[PDB]
C-alpha cells in the first residue's frame, strides 16, 4: 500500500512540529557564531566604567567659558587621573580617557589653539578654549552605554559577530546555548560507487552524499559520513542503527519510491519501529520524500529518507531538512527567508507546487531581483524558486512576473 | 600633516585594485565550499555511462505496440543485463537500471497490468503493455546528461554544494583552487584588557578583536589572533612584523586618528616602510580608516588599520576588508550584494555617506524588504544601510523611502 500523498503545507508543518529542540551546553563565547543563547546575559560592569572623553582635546569646567587656561596635566587612555581641575585650569584628554575630577565637559582640540608648550615641545602648558562648552559635552558618563545589572542579550538570540563582541565587552566568556545537531548521511543503491572510484559496468558515482553533507556543513552543523548502503534490508537496518547511535538526525537518499528494491519505508516501519509521519508529498520534485521519528529513552531521533534523484535530494534537503536543523539548534522561528523576485523565463505550472534552484541577481535601481533558473556559471545557486500549483485561473507564469524565492545561499 | 580625505568611491576602488589574487593549491573536492576553481574541470565518463531507465516498469520494443508480453528477466540497478529483448518480449527495469539490448523504450508500471507471476509470487512472467511507447521514451541515452570530454565547471566558479556534487559525479576528487587568505587581527591601546579579565581602573575590555575575528571567520577564512598591543611604536612594529610573517592580511584597530598616542600611520610609513594608499576616508563612521600595501620578495601583504571605535571597526571591516578577502580567494567580482529596501524610520543625512547595521525583513506580498537600523533582538544584523550624502535637494529620508542595503548576513 503506497503512503497517502501529503500536501506540501502539511508535510512542512509536520516536520517543524515533530522536530525536537536539542538540549543546552556551555560554550566559550568565541565559539558562539550561529548559536542561540539559552540564557539571558547580564553586564556585571558599567560601560564606560569611568566617565570617558568622546574626543581628543581638553577636559574643562564649562562654567569657566572660553579663554586662556593652564594645562595641569594629561589624562591618557588606561590611566586613572590623580589631579582635580580647578576653575581656570584644564587637562589634556584623548578619546576614551577618563575625565578628571573637577571637569564637567570636553572641548575637542579643533575648538582650541595652543599658546605655550615646553622648550622640548614635549608638554603643552596653556591653551585657548574658543567655545562655550555645554556641561556634559563630549563625555560618556559611567554606564552611558551599558549599566551594571542590565540584560544585554536575551535568551533566544541567534548570535553573529556583533553579539560575540558584546559578550567580550561585558566579560561573559562562557554562555549557555542549544547544542547543534549531529547529522549522519548515507546513500543507498547497488549501482553506486564512491567518488574516488573508476566506473564499472552498470554503475555510477554517488553524488548525493557529497551534495547533502556539503549543504549541511554550509549551515555550520557537524556531520557523519555513513557511506553507501546496498539495496537490502539487513544492511539498511544496520546502517540506520549506526546513525541513531552516532547522530541526532539521519538523512538517507534513494530507495523510497515503489520500485522492487526500494526498501527504506519497510525497514523504518517493520525493522526499526520508527513512526513514518509521511511517505509521499504532493510536490515537484520530491514525491517519495519520507519523514520519521524514533523515540528512544526520552530522546527523539529524526530521519529524513530523501528521494534518490540528485536534484530531488538537494531540493528536499533545502525545503525540509535545513528548517528542521534550525529548530533543533534553538532558532525560535526556523523557517527560511522567502523573498519576491521577477521570473527570468516563462514557466508552465504543474498541478504540484514546483521548486527549482536559481540565482538571484539585483540590477541597477530595480527594486526586485531577477530569478534565473539553473558568468552566471561562476555563481552558485542562492535561491529556490517556489512556483504555485496550476489553477483554472493560472496555467503559466511569464517573464517579469513576481514569484516567491526561498534563500538557500548567501545573496 | 593629516592624510587627505579620500572619497568613499576612490577608497573602495583603491582597495580592490591594489589587493592581490592569491596563488593556487590542489584540494580534495569535499573541502571545496566557498573556493574558486583555478582550472576547468572535464568529465572523463558519460553520464549516464549506459542507457538508463527513467522509470520503474518495462524495457520494450516500441514497434511491438500495446499487448501481452513475455517477461524474459529483470535489469536491476548496478548490473549490466546479458539478455536481448526480441519482438514480443520485455524486461522488467527499475529507475536508473541499464536498458537491455533489443529494447528501445520504457513503459512505466502504471501503463501496464500484471497477468501471470510465479506460484511463489517472486517473479513476474507476462505483462499487458497498455500504451503505444514512442521510441526512446523514458530512457536517458549514454551521455544524455554529461558527455565524456565535456567541460562541466569553468575556472572562476565559486563553488557551493551542487558544484561539490558535480565533482563527485564526474570523479574529479582533486581540484586546483585559489588559496584562502590567512588574516591576522590585533587590537591596540593601553586601556584594553582581555575579555577574560576583570576590569581595573581606567581600563575596558577589548571587543574589536572578537568582533573582527568573528566577521572574518563567518566568511570561512583562517585567522590569527595577535592579541592586544600597547600605544608604543616598538611594540606596534614588532606585532606588525609578526602579522606579516604569519598572515596574508593584517587588520589592526585603534591608533589611527590624530590623538597624541595614535601611532599606527607613523609606524606603517617610517618603521615598516609600507605604502599608505589612504589614511582618511570621507565616510560616517570610519574617518581615520587606513589601507596600506607592503611588497616583500614579490609577495604583496595587505594592511587595514581600522578605527578604534567598535561600531566604526565592524562597519569598515564589512565595507573594505571583506571585499578585499573575496578578491584574494579568487572571486572574480568580489563586490558585495546591494539590495533595495524600505527605511523603517526617518533619517537626517550627513554630508558624508553614512553606513549603519540593520536587519532586513520581508513582509507578506511586499516586494521590498524593510530595513530596521540596530523578537528583532533575537536576529543578528544582516544588512548595512548605505545612506546617500546630503545635497541641497535631499537633506532627509523618510520612513518607506527606498534605500541601498549591503548584505552582510544570511538573509
Amino acid at each position: 500500500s503506497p503512503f497517502p500523498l501529503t500536501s506540501m503545507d502539511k508535510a512542512f508543518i509536520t516536520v517543524l512540529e515533530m522536530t525536537p529542540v536539542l538540549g543546552t551546553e556551555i560554550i566559550n563565547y568565541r565559539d558562539g557564531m550561529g548559536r542561540v543563547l539559552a540564557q539571558d546575559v547580564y553586564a556585571k560592569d558599567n560601560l564606560p566604567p569611568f566617565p570617558a572623553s568622546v574626543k581628543d582635546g581638553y577636559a574643562v569646567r564649562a562654567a569657566d567659558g572660553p579663554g586662556d587656561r593652564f594645562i595641569i596635566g594629561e589624562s591618557q587612555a588606561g590611566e586613572q587621573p590623580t589631579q582635580t581641575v580647578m576653575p581656570g585650569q584644564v587637562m589634556r584628554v584623548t578619546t576614551g580617557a577618563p575625565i578628571p575630577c573637577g571637569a564637567d565637559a570636553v572641548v575637542q582640540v579643533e575648538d582650541t589653539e595652543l599658546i605655550r608648550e615646553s622648550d622640548d615641545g614635549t608638554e603643552e602648558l596653556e591653551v585657548r578654549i574658543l567655545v562655550q562648552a555645554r556641561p556634559g559635552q563630549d563625555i560618556r558618563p559611567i554606564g552611558h552605554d551599558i549599566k551594571r545589572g542590565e540584560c544585554v542579550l536575551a535568551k533566544g538570540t541567534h548570535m553573529g559577530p556583533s553579539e560575540i563582541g558584546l559578550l567580550a565587552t561585558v566579560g561573559v566568556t562562557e554562555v549557555e546555548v542549544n547544542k547543534f545537531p549531529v547529522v549522519a548521511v548515507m546513500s543507498t543503491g547497488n549501482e553506486l560507487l564512491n567518488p574516488e572510484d573508476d566506473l564499472l559496468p552498470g554503475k555510477i558515482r554517488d553524488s548525493n552524499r557529497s551534495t547533502l553533507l556539503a549543504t549541511i556543513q554550509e549551515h555550520g552543523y557537524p556531520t557523519i559520513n555513513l557511506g553507501i548502503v546496498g539495496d537490502n534490508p539487513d544492511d539498511l537496518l544496520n546502517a540506520l542503527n549506526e546513525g541513531i547511535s552516532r547522530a541526532d538526525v539521519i538523512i538517507t537518499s534513494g530507495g523510497v519510491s515503489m520500485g522492487e528494491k526500494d526498501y527504506l519505508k519497510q525497514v523504518l516501519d517493520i525493522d526499526l519501529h520508527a513512526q513514518i509521519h509521511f511517505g509521499r508529498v504532493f510536490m515537484k520534485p520530491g514525491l517519495p520524500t519520507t519523514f520519521a521519528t524514533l523515540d528512544i529513552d526520552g530522546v527523539r531521533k529524526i530521519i529524513f529518507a530523501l528521494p534518490g534523484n540528485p536534484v530531488s535530494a538537494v531540493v528536499t534537503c533545502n525545503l525540509f531538512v535545513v528548517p528542521a536543523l534550525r529548530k533543533m539548534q534553538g532558532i525560535l522561528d526556523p523557517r527560511p527567508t522567502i523573498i519576491k523576485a521577477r521570473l527570468s523565463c516563462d514557466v508552465k505550472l504543474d498541478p504540484r507546487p514546483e521548486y527549482h534552484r536559481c540565482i538571484l541577481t539585483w540590477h541597477h535601481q530595480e527594486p526586485l531581483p531577477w530569478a534565473q533558473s539553473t558568468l552566471m556559471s561562476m555563481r552558485s545557486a542562492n535561491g529556490l524558486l517556489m512556483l504555485p500549483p496550476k489553477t483554472e485561473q493560472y496555467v503559466e507564469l511569464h517573464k517579469g512576473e513576481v514569484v516567491d524565492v526561498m534563500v538557500i545561499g548567501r545573496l | 600633516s593629516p592624510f587627505p580625505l579620500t572619497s568613499m568611491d576612490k577608497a573602495f576602488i583603491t582597495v580592490l585594485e591594489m589587493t592581490p589574487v592569491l596563488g593556487t593549491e590542489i584540494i580534495n573536492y569535499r573541502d571545496g565550499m566557498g573556493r574558486v576553481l583555478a582550472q576547468d574541470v572535464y568529465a572523463k565518463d558519460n553520464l549516464p555511462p549506459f542507457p538508463a531507465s527513467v522509470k520503474d516498469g518495462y524495457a520494450v520494443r516500441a514497434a511491438d505496440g500495446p499487448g501481452d508480453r513475455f517477461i524474459i528477466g529483470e535489469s536491476q540497478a548496478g548490473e549490466q543485463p546479458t539478455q536481448t529483448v526480441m519482438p514480443g518480449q520485455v524486461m522488467r527495469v527499475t529507475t536508473g537500471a541499464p536498458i537491455p539490448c533489443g529494447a528501445d523504450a520504457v513503459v512505466q508500471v502504471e501503463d501496464t497490468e500484471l497477468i501471470r507471476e510465479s506460484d511463489d509470487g517472486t517473479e513476474e512472467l507476462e505483462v499487458r503493455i497498455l500504451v503505444q511507447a514512442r521510441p526512446g521514451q523514458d530512457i536517458r541515452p549514454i551521455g544524455h546528461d554529461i558527455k565524456r570530454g565535456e567541460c562541466v565547471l569553468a575556472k572562476g566558479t565559486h563553488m557551493g554544494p551542487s558544484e561539490i556534487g558535480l565533482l563527485a559525479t564526474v570523479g574529479v576528487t582533486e581540484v586546483e583552487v585559489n588559496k584562502f587568505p590567512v588574516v591576522a587581527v590585533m587590537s591596540t591601546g593601553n586601556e584594553l584588557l582581555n575579555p577574560e579579565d576583570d576590569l581595573l581602573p581606567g581600563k575596558i575590555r577589548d571587543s574589536n578583536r572578537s568582533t573582527l575575528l568573528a566577521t572574518i571567520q563567518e566568511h570561512g577564512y583562517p585567522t590569527i589572533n595577535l592579541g592586544i598591543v600597547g600605544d608604543n611604536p616598538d611594540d606596534l612594529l614588532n606585532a606588525l612584523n609578526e602579522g606579516i610573517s604569519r598572515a596574508d592580511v593584517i587588520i589592526t584597530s585603534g591608533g589611527v586618528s590624530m590623538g597624541e598616542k595614535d601611532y599606527l600611520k607613523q609606524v606603517l610609513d617610517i618603521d615598516l616602510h609600507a605604502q599608505i594608499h589612504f589614511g582618511r576616508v570621507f565616510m560616517k563612521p570610519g574617518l581615520p580608516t587606513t589601507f596600506a600595501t607592503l611588497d616583500i620578495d614579490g609577495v604583496r601583504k595587505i594592511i587595514f588599520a581600522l578605527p578604534g571605535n567598535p561600531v566604526s571597526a565592524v562597519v569598515t571591516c564589512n565595507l573594505f576588508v571583506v571585499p578585499a578577502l573575496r578578491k584574494m580567494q579568487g572571486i572574480l567580482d568580489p563586490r558585495p550584494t546591494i539590495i533595495k529596501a524600505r527605511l523603517s524610520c526617518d533619517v537626517k543625512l550627513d554630508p558624508r555617506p553614512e553606513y549603519h547595521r540593520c536587519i532586513l525583513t520581508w513582509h507578506h506580498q511586499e516586494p521590498l524588504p524593510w530595513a530596521q537600523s540596530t523578537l528583532m533582538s533575537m536576529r543578528s544584523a544582516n544588512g548595512l544601510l548605505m545612506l546617500p550624502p546630503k545635497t541641497e535637494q535631499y537633506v532627509e529620508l523618510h520612513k518607506g523611502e527606498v534605500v541601498d542595503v549591503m548584505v552582510i548576513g544570511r538573509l
Partner: peptide, 10 residues
C-alpha cells in the same frame, strides 16, 4: 509565510 509558492496580486 507559506512553503507553497503564491501568485502576486500587485
Amino acid at each position: 509565510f507559506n512553503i507553497v509558492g503564491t501568485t502576486y496580486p500587485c
